Design an enzyme around this catalytic site. Structure first.
Site, PDB file in Angstrom:
ATOM      1  N   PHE A 209      41.375   8.093 -22.372  1.00  0.00           N
ATOM      2  CA  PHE A 209      41.496   7.884 -20.918  1.00  0.00           C
ATOM      3  C   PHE A 209      42.613   6.880 -20.717  1.00  0.00           C
ATOM      4  O   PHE A 209      42.695   5.851 -21.402  1.00  0.00           O
ATOM      5  CB  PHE A 209      40.142   7.460 -20.316  1.00  0.00           C
ATOM      6  CG  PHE A 209      40.064   7.515 -18.820  1.00  0.00           C
ATOM      7  CD1 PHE A 209      39.802   8.712 -18.174  1.00  0.00           C
ATOM      8  CD2 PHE A 209      40.182   6.372 -18.074  1.00  0.00           C
ATOM      9  CE1 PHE A 209      39.686   8.763 -16.797  1.00  0.00           C
ATOM     10  CE2 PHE A 209      40.079   6.424 -16.689  1.00  0.00           C
ATOM     11  CZ  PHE A 209      39.826   7.624 -16.056  1.00  0.00           C
ATOM     12  N   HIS A 212      44.213   2.190 -16.136  1.00  0.00           N
ATOM     13  CA  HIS A 212      43.698   2.159 -14.794  1.00  0.00           C
ATOM     14  C   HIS A 212      43.125   0.796 -14.498  1.00  0.00           C
ATOM     15  O   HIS A 212      42.865  -0.017 -15.380  1.00  0.00           O
ATOM     16  CB  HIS A 212      42.599   3.212 -14.652  1.00  0.00           C
ATOM     17  CG  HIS A 212      41.383   2.938 -15.462  1.00  0.00           C
ATOM     18  ND1 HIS A 212      41.308   3.224 -16.806  1.00  0.00           N
ATOM     19  CD2 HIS A 212      40.191   2.395 -15.122  1.00  0.00           C
ATOM     20  CE1 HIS A 212      40.109   2.896 -17.255  1.00  0.00           C
ATOM     21  NE2 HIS A 212      39.415   2.380 -16.254  1.00  0.00           N
ATOM     22  N   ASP A 214      39.685  -0.593 -12.369  1.00  0.00           N
ATOM     23  CA  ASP A 214      38.414  -0.033 -11.894  1.00  0.00           C
ATOM     24  C   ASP A 214      38.241  -0.028 -10.378  1.00  0.00           C
ATOM     25  O   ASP A 214      38.715  -0.941  -9.663  1.00  0.00           O
ATOM     26  CB  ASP A 214      37.206  -0.805 -12.451  1.00  0.00           C
ATOM     27  CG  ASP A 214      36.975  -0.569 -13.889  1.00  0.00           C
ATOM     28  OD1 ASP A 214      37.677   0.303 -14.457  1.00  0.00           O
ATOM     29  OD2 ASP A 214      36.126  -1.212 -14.524  1.00  0.00           O
ATOM     30  N   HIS A 268      43.257  -1.515 -18.028  1.00  0.00           N
ATOM     31  CA  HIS A 268      42.705  -1.230 -19.339  1.00  0.00           C
ATOM     32  C   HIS A 268      42.686   0.261 -19.593  1.00  0.00           C
ATOM     33  O   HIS A 268      42.816   1.051 -18.646  1.00  0.00           O
ATOM     34  CB  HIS A 268      41.281  -1.834 -19.444  1.00  0.00           C
ATOM     35  CG  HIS A 268      40.342  -1.391 -18.372  1.00  0.00           C
ATOM     36  ND1 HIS A 268      40.385  -1.882 -17.087  1.00  0.00           N
ATOM     37  CD2 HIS A 268      39.326  -0.495 -18.402  1.00  0.00           C
ATOM     38  CE1 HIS A 268      39.451  -1.288 -16.361  1.00  0.00           C
ATOM     39  NE2 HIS A 268      38.793  -0.444 -17.138  1.00  0.00           N
TER      40      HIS A 268
HETATM   41  C1  LIG Z   1      38.152   5.223 -15.204  1.00  0.00           C
HETATM   42  C2  LIG Z   1      36.864   4.740 -15.438  1.00  0.00           C
HETATM   43  S1  LIG Z   1      36.354   2.986 -15.150  1.00  0.00           S
HETATM   44  C3  LIG Z   1      35.803   5.772 -15.756  1.00  0.00           C
HETATM   45  N1  LIG Z   1      35.171   5.735 -14.455  1.00  0.00           N
HETATM   46  C4  LIG Z   1      35.224   6.733 -13.602  1.00  0.00           C
HETATM   47  O1  LIG Z   1      35.729   7.768 -14.031  1.00  0.00           O
HETATM   48  C5  LIG Z   1      34.627   6.582 -12.238  1.00  0.00           C
HETATM   49  C6  LIG Z   1      33.217   7.134 -12.234  1.00  0.00           C
HETATM   50  C7  LIG Z   1      32.683   6.930 -10.814  1.00  0.00           C
HETATM   51  C8  LIG Z   1      31.327   7.620 -10.592  1.00  0.00           C
HETATM   52  N2  LIG Z   1      31.490   9.074 -10.854  1.00  0.00           N
HETATM   53  C9  LIG Z   1      30.824   7.313  -9.184  1.00  0.00           C
HETATM   54  O2  LIG Z   1      30.774   8.296  -8.396  1.00  0.00           O
HETATM   55  O3  LIG Z   1      30.508   6.132  -8.937  1.00  0.00           O
HETATM   56  C10 LIG Z   1      34.808   5.275 -16.753  1.00  0.00           C
HETATM   57  O4  LIG Z   1      33.618   5.210 -16.470  1.00  0.00           O
HETATM   58  O5  LIG Z   1      35.266   4.926 -18.005  1.00  0.00           O
HETATM   59  C11 LIG Z   1      34.387   4.432 -19.022  1.00  0.00           C
HETATM   60  C12 LIG Z   1      34.782   5.163 -20.300  1.00  0.00           C
HETATM   61  O6  LIG Z   1      35.602   6.115 -20.169  1.00  0.00           O
HETATM   62  O7  LIG Z   1      34.295   4.738 -21.346  1.00  0.00           O
HETATM   63  C13 LIG Z   1      34.611   2.915 -19.094  1.00  0.00           C
HETATM   64  C14 LIG Z   1      33.983   2.196 -17.866  1.00  0.00           C
HETATM   65  C15 LIG Z   1      36.138   2.732 -19.308  1.00  0.00           C
HETATM   66  O8  LIG Z   1      36.912   2.043 -18.328  1.00  0.00           O
HETATM   67 FE   LIG Z   2      37.525   1.354 -16.364  1.00  0.00          FE
END
Ligand SMILES: C=C(S)[C@H](NC(=O)CCC[C@H](N)C(=O)O)C(=O)O[C@@H](C(=O)O)[C@H](C)CO
Ligand SMILES: [Fe+2]
EC number: 1.21.3.1
Length: 329
Positions: A209, A212, A214, A268
């Site tokens: 990923f 980005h 958060d 990150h």
């Molecule tokens: C870009 C990020 S912070 C990803 N988050 C999302 O895609 C948003 C989800 C929102 C959810 N669907 C909602 O509706 O609230 C995420 O969860 O990444 C985690 C990972 O990939 O391990 C980890 C946190 C890495 O940054």
């Molecule tokens: Fe994240």
């Protein structure tokens, strides 16, 4: 090699009690970490993360393809137009490795005023069949409240850190209306691992990923003990050590907005690792109509040239932008 990021371990247990001085000393640690790399591990948090991991594994490893379609968000299943946020996010073998299950506030029931109004970002959770996943829904709902409680405590620490009263954020973080979400992410081991599911950064690092910030006030994350996260600092991207006993905490862009970038939302990314692992974030979101007046703790009068932004506006627009930038998860 890549250098290790400074990610201090902060004992947050005073934030659950009534020793104000002790709380101030935790707040200072949060301030320091927030001004440095933007990440810290919360330890002595009181949550049974091993059991969370076990229950999550039992779910991920037993759910079937049939169930995944039946729980799928709209992006994967056109029949489910109400499921934008909550439900199953499928993998695409040969193309997309990650898969996940997202749920929201358990109080978003059919009779909830925001569900009746069909307000954006509010949905009624979907759950697998109880006979197929005994105890899962109950466990997951309870986990929501357990991590809500930790997050409330952390929000008292951030408020004190910024020179505010301890309820400055927490007064807007309420069981009846929080837009907070849990995501139960499965990153699989695959042999062979499809190249199409691996991204490559400008610096050559293989990623799952991309970079980005958060979309949250703060993010409260449990991960398996497999190193994967990196944070951009002035010294470049640095590795965040894994710690599957603590919660990794960072600010989202709503905090950056409210503090005029005093507490930045750290940039990150997630390195590609060929390992069967879990990533279980809780995104600390406020209520749809929550507005905190932006301020600046580096300015004598505390004033900021940012305009107030409702949390609902922030969230709906952020979630879309994230998908546009880094792809549908
Ligand atoms: C870009 C990020 S912070 C990803 N988050 C999302 O895609 C948003 C989800 C929102 C959810 N669907 C909602 O509706 O609230 C995420 O969860 O990444 C985690 C990972 O990939 O391990 C980890 C946190 C890495 O940054
Ligand atoms: Fe994240």
């Amino acid at each position: 090699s890549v250098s290790k990021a400074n990610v201090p371990k902060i004992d947050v247990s005073p934030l659950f009690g009534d020793d104000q001085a002790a709380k101030m000393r935790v707040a200072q640690q949060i301030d320091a970490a927030s001004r440095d790399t933007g990440f810290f591990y919360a330890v002595n948090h009181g949550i049974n993360v091993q059991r969370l991991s076990q229950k999550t594994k039992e779910f991920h490893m037993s759910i079937t393809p049939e169930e995944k379609w039946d729980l799928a968000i709209r992006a994967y299943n056109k029949e489910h137009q109400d499921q934008v946020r909550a439900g199953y996010y499928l993998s695409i073998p040969g193309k997309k490795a990650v898969e996940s299950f997202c749920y929201l506030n358990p109080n978003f029931t059919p009779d909830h005023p925001r569900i009746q109004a069909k307000t954006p970002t509010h949905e009624v959770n979907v759950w697998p069949d109880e006979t197929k996943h005994p105890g899962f829904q109950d466990f997951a709902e309870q986990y929501y409240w357990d991590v809500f409680g930790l997050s409330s405590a952390l929000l008292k620490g951030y408020a004190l850190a910024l020179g505010k009263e301890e309820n400055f954020f927490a007064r807007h973080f309420k069981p009846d209306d929080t837009l907070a979400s849990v995501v139960l992410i499965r990153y699989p081991y695959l042999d062979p691992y499809p190249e199409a599911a691996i991204k490559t950064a400008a610096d050559g690092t293989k990623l799952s990923f991309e970079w980005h910030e958060d979309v949250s006030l703060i993010t409260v994350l449990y991960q398996s003990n497999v190193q994967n996260l990196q944070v951009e600092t002035a010294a470049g991207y640095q590795d965040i050590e894994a710690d599957d006993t603590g919660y990794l905490i960072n600010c989202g862009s709503y905090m950056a907005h409210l503090t005029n970038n005093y507490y930045k939302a750290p940039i990150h990314r997630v390195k590609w690792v060929n390992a069967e692992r879990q990533s279980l974030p809780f995104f600390v979101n406020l209520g749809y109509d929550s507005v905190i007046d932006p301020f600046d703790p580096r300015e004598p009068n505390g004033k900021s040239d940012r305009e107030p932004l409702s949390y609902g506006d922030y969230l709906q627009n952020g979630l879309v932008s994230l998908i546009n930038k880094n792809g549908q998860t």
